[PDB]
Amino acid sequence: AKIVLVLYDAGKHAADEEKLYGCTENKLGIANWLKDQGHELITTSDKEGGNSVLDQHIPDADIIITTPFHPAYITKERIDKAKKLKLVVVAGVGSDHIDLDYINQTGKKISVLEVTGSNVVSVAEHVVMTMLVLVRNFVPAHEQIINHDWEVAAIAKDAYDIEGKTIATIGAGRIGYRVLERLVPFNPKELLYYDYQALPKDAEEKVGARRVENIEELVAQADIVTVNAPLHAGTKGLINKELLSKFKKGAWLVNTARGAICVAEDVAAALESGQLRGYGGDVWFPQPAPKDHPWRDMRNKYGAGNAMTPHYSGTTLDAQTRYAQGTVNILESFFTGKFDYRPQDIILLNGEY
Amino acid sequence: AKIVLVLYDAGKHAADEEKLYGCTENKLGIANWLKDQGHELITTSDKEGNSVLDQHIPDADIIITTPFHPAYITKERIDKAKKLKLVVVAGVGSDHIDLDYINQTGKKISVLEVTGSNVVSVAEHVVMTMLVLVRNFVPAHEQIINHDWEVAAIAKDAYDIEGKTIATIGAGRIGYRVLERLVPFNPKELLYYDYQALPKDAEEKVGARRVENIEELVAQADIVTVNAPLHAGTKGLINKELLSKFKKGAWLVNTARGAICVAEDVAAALESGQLRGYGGDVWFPQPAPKDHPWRDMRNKYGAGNAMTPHYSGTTLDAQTRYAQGTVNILESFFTGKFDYRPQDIILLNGEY
């Protein structure tokens, strides 16, 4: 079987860290396994333009493996040319780069699987970390040290404890809930959530969570807001100038979900105005963020309140090990003809939901 | 009564933030409370050198200090303080007060601090610092603001805190609250070393296992955090010998006292990879000199440093607790009820 694996080139970084499975140099740790089984593995980061290594191999690829961290766009056009395509894998979680709709609507016999649950802890930790960084004003504090300064009042004047804050999640899916779980022993004033359906009463109670009917009422009472929902018609451009005006004045906002859920210039304005005290997270639109993206240079009135990182929260080394293992499991399920996939991993099975 | 309150000048920052109580400009938010009660308040930052503190010491009934800008209540000052009845720390930490001398004199001076008021603030700082180091946040943010984007450069040394073995040296108020906050992160195990056991049911609440000696503790730990007082057993505890027994690539956090570490030994361990990261907000000497080795030290990747100035206990939330607790102490004294919170007492009329 011919497998096309699309990942980024990690360059010298792959040489520094053998556990960095998720790059072209290290090949998810599956190269020898595939070779020993008689399979042909094409690994490439070249995924854009008709001339690309990806497109060269598409016509006779049996399997394509992709990553949200360097997503090969498995478009209608590519699917149509992929005459032997049987399985598309996401070595991680997130599938917007694959035209699931097209596969399902046509009824093409193509399975699409991802390593469900493998990303969740990593992102949830990143959220709580980012909350803490922002609320406790860590960034300018650290900057003082490395700049050979020491002016405690300059930091203290905008530093709080997370204790006694009201904390709101937009979305209480796997990540949102794991964030709430992690926030419990921090003794927030209250944990709150908005979602299209309720958490079960026992789940709500385990984290002391209260359901708020609408986002406007949710954000109005929240010291801290975190976005943990997918990008869709209900969430695209959700965090805009209008909704931001409904936030608590000097609220902190974290988004490790999708960049497009925010209107980027609206967030920058709100931070600079004091409507937000801080913003952080690792997701951008466009992504990778251009060098000029407003979220890079945006600061609050004190020159802080920015806890942005490149998009990496779900690709820690621990997450990458789970992605690599999960990819092997999926591939073994396929190669053996068992198709004994983990039910949660199945996005489409031979084109069906 | 005459109350001398020794803080620091926050300058323009005091005007920026009204909840910044711990500075001379804002006078713990007690200046009017004190005047309304008929007391005289002297506020100064001048504590070195005929300094203003020294001018007022001879007839101060009460001196209020802050551990963040400590006025040293020295042997000489105790001698000169003819009316001294009460010394208060608007916060927690009494290193700057010669308690041994006060006790020795037989003078009826109470010394109180707002016990418990800094604990959550420091505990949060610890867990934050752990996450920042483990998840490799510092170089990640630096990329963004440097207009770069190279995920692999960050990911190559970024881990989840989940599945890590985490150890605290000391399981007192801060140490225990750190452990409590770590529980839902699913660590492989939470461990502690201390001179006394956690009460059984507190031990079981965080799933902690006691380790009998420090060497054994640090040898199995992915992350170590220092939450012990500075004394004979802990001064220079974290030296090159002990560090060489750390798990290779461990993360170390210290928000307790700078002097529990040997500064150059920690820096050496970070540069060599014995530590993957070091963080915390305590320094020795403090404030840190401009070339203090902990400022510039990095792991081989140019990261592994999550140092801050000494501010974890200075958050606005803690400062509110300090101001309120200082009111509580003062009013217990003023009313002559002396109905102090038992945990606030360091000396009661000179006695431990």
Curated annotation (Swiss-Prot), chain A:
Q: Name one GO biological process term.
A: methanol oxidation
- Give a brief account of the activity's temperature dependence: Broad temperature optima between 45 and 55 degrees Celsius. Reaction rate increases steeply up to 55 degrees Celsius. 50% of activity lost after incubation for 20 minutes at 57 degrees Celsius. Thermal stability increases in the presence of glycerol.
The protein's location, in the record's own words, is: Cytoplasm
Q: Quick one: which residues bind substrate?
A: 93, 119
For this protein, the activity regulation entry reads: Cu(2+), Hg and p-chloromercuribenzoate are strong inhibitors of enzyme activity and Ca(2+), Mg(2+), Zn(2+), Mn(2+), Cd(2+) and Sn(2+) have no effect on activity indicating a cysteine residue in the protein is essential for enzyme activity or to maintain the proper structure of the enzyme. Nitrite and nitrate inhibit some enzyme activity, however cyanide, azide, thiocyanate and cyanate are strong inhibitors of the enzymatic reaction. The inhibition of cyanide is competitive with formate and reversible.
The record's top EC class is oxidoreductase
Q: What is the effect of changing residue 119 to A?
A: 94-fold decrease in substrate affinity for formate and 2700-fold decrease in substrate affinity for NAD. A significant reduction in catalytic activity compared to the wild-type
Residues the record annotates as the site (Important for catalytic activity) are: 258, 311
Q: Which GO terms describe its molecular function?
A: ATP binding; formate dehydrogenase (NAD+) activity; NAD+ binding; oxidoreductase activity, acting on the CH-OH group of donors, NAD or NADP as acceptor; protein homodimerization activity
Catalysed conversion reaction: formate + NAD(+) = CO2 + NADH
Which keywords belong to this entry? ATP-binding, Cytoplasm, NAD, Nucleotide-binding, Oxidoreductase
The job of this chain, per UniProt, is described as:
Catalyzes the NAD(+)-dependent oxidation of formate to carbon dioxide. Formate oxidation is the final step in the methanol oxidation pathway in methylotrophic microorganisms. Has a role in the detoxification of exogenous formate in non-methylotrophic organisms.
Q: Which family does it belong to?
A: Belongs to the D-isomer specific 2-hydroxyacid dehydrogenase family. FDH subfamily.
Q: Which HAMAP family does the entry link to?
A: Formate_dehydrogenase (MF_03210)
Task: Tell me what this protein is called.
Answer: Formate dehydrogenase
Q: Which gene encodes it?
A: FDH1
UniProtKB/Swiss-Prot annotation, chain B:
Under the heading Gene3D superfamilies, the entry gives: NAD(P)-binding Rossmann-like Domain
**What does a knockout show?**
Is able to grow on methanol in a batch culture experiment, but its growth is greatly inhibited and a toxic level of formate accumulates in the medium. Formate is not detected in the medium in a methanol-limited chemostat culture but deletion mutant shows only one-fourth of the growth yield of the wild-type.
Where's it mainly located?
cytoplasm
What's the biotech application?
Answer: Ideal catalyst for synthesizing chiral compounds of high enantiomeric purity from prochiral precursors due to a favorable thermodynamic equilibrium, the oxidation of formate to carbon dioxide while also reducing NAD to NADH. However, the necessesity for the presence of large quantities of the enzyme and its rapid inactivation under biotransformation conditions results in higher costs for the biocatalyst industry. In order to make this enzymatic reduction viable and to perform it on a larger scale a more efficient and cost effective process has been established.
Q: Which InterPro entries does the record cross-reference, listed alphabetically?
A: D-isomer_2_OHA_DH_cat_dom, D-isomer_DH_CS, D-isomer_DH_CS1, D-isomer_DH_NAD-bd, FDH_NAD-dep, NAD(P)-bd_dom_sf
Broadest EC class assigned to this enzyme: oxidoreductase
What happens on changing residue 9 to G? In strain: 2.2159
Positions bearing the site annotation: Important for catalytic activity:
257, 310
- Report activity regulation: Cu(2+), Hg and p-chloromercuribenzoate are strong inhibitors of enzyme activity and Ca(2+), Mg(2+), Zn(2+), Mn(2+), Cd(2+) and Sn(2+) have no effect on activity indicating a cysteine residue in the protein is essential for enzyme activity or to maintain the proper structure of the enzyme. Nitrite and nitrate inhibit some enzyme activity, however cyanide, azide, thiocyanate and cyanate are strong inhibitors of the enzymatic reaction. The inhibition of cyanide is competitive with formate and reversible.
PANTHER family to which the protein is assigned, alphabetical: FORMATE DEHYDROGENASE 1
The entry sums up its family as follows: Belongs to the D-isomer specific 2-hydroxyacid dehydrogenase family. FDH subfamily.
NCBIfam families named among the record's database cross-references = PRK07574.1
- The identity of this protein, by name, is Formate dehydrogenase
Phylogenetic lineage: Eukaryota, Fungi, Dikarya, Ascomycota, Saccharomycotina
